[PDB]
Paper text:
Here, we identify functional heterotrimeric G-protein subunits in Entamoeba histolytica, constituting a signaling pathway which, when perturbed, is seen to regulate multiple cellular processes required for pathogenesis. Like mammalian counterparts, EhGα1 forms a heterotrimer with EhGβγ that is dependent on guanine nucleotide exchange and hydrolysis. Despite engaging a classical G-protein effector, EhRGS-RhoGEF, EhGα1 diverges from mammalian Gα subunits and cannot be classified within mammalian Gα subfamilies, as highlighted by distinct structural features in our crystal structure of EhGα1 in the inactive conformation. Here we demonstrate that functional heterotrimeric G-protein subunits are encoded by the pathogen Entamoeba histolytica, including single Gα and Gβ subunits, and two Gγ subunits.
Residue numbers in the entry: 22 to 220, 223 to 303, 318 to 355
Write the structure that this text describes.
């Protein structure tokens, strides 16, 4: 029987990106027909993300040199099926325009999907008539996984079964207790959300923390190893330079140091629990960059050993 792993997290923690990444690395990836289903949302995101920046450049007074010609940037209507011929061209001009670039740097804050820059840098290839999304596009594109995804992979000749629990907090609860005999629960959280508000909970950070505190006391998850992926370490490093951590936690003295800062956030989730960073009741932690296949491969590897060691010591095996 396969080793079972359950992914939990808040929204926009990147847990769905982790799951696609493991299917690519250890599953069979995604076949052309599965990939082609993502064409419309990717094509749509190209336009909507850029409308966002144009609108924000007005709200934030960064005048534009360039002026869009295409049908697509004269309307708020949903995005049609084949792009107008001029769409490609003015996406490239727009992204190179001084005012748009200035607006992009003030990304904190309005709400710009993480995939924006990737979409723009890839527009020549996305706007082609015969374009079929690649696995890398699927990694970077934003999708809403209304939540219950299963699959199997193998790692170093050992069967794994992955349960990806999505949905509202209210249905997430339903599924956690449905699955029996889970060997490992992986909690994913976005480091870059430390400054984002909400309104029960006030901020994204406190909402994630309370989710995690659930996992730690959930009686159906006793027996399961608890791992935390502090995700979006890349985004967090950079974000720290525009929104310093002590503007959110004035009781913090570590400054620009993304390592010390990630630890500070990590310690807010784990309190008095014993913890262990896999990079050299007990909670294992590791920062991650889910859009980096190489990073997720190296990191899940450490994880397999932690899961195996633990199971051996708990009288479970294979
Ligand atoms: N830059 C960066 N983006 C990420 C990372 N992890 C996830 N994302 C992005 O976050 C967006 C949505 O995250 P998603 O996997 O759908 O979250 P979930 O479904 O709520 O668990 C996608 O556009 C991803 O490309 C990361 O480590 N780095």
């Amino acid at each position: 029987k396969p080793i079972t792993v359950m992914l939990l997290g808040s929204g926009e923690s990147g847990k769905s990106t982790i799951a696609k990444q493991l299917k690519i690395l250890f599953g069979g990836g995604f076949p052309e027909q599965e990939r082609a289903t993502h064409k419309s949302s990717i094509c749509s995101n190209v336009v909507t993300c850029m409308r966002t920046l144009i609108e924000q450049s007005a709200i934030l007074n960064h005048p534009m040199k360039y002026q869009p010609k295409s049908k697509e940037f004269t309307t708020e209507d949903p995005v049609t099926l084949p792009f107008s011929p001029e769409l490609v061209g003015d996406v490239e001009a727009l992204w190179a325009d001084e005012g748009i670039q200035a607006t992009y740097e003030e990304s904190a804050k309005f709400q710009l999907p993480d995939c924006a820059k990737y979409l723009f840098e890839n527009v020549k290839r996305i706007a082609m008539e015969d374009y079929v999304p690649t696995e890398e596009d699927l990694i970077h594109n934003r999708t809403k996984t209304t939540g219950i995804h299963e699959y199997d992979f193998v790692v170093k000749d050992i069967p794994f079964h992955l349960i990806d629990v999505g949905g509202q907090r209210s249905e997430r609860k339903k599924w956690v207790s449905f699955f029996s005999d889970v060997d490992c629960a992986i909690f994913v959280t976005s480091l870059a959300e430390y400054d984002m508000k909400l309104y029960g909970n006030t901020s994204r950070l406190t909402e994630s923390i309370a989710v995690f505190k659930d996992i730690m006391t959930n009686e159906f998850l006793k027996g399961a190893v608890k791992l935390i992926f502090l995700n979006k370490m890349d985004l967090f490093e950079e974000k720290l330079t525009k929104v310093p951590l002590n503007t959110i936690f004035p009781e913090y003295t570590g400054g620009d140091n993304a390592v010390m800062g990630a630890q500070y956030i990590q310690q807010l989730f784990t309190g008095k629990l014993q913890t262990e960073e896999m990079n050299i009741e007990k909670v294992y932690t590791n920062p991650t960059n889910a859009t980096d296949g190489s990073n997720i491969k190296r990191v899940f590897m450490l994880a397999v050993d932690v899961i195996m060691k633990n199971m051996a010591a708990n009288g479970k095996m294979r």
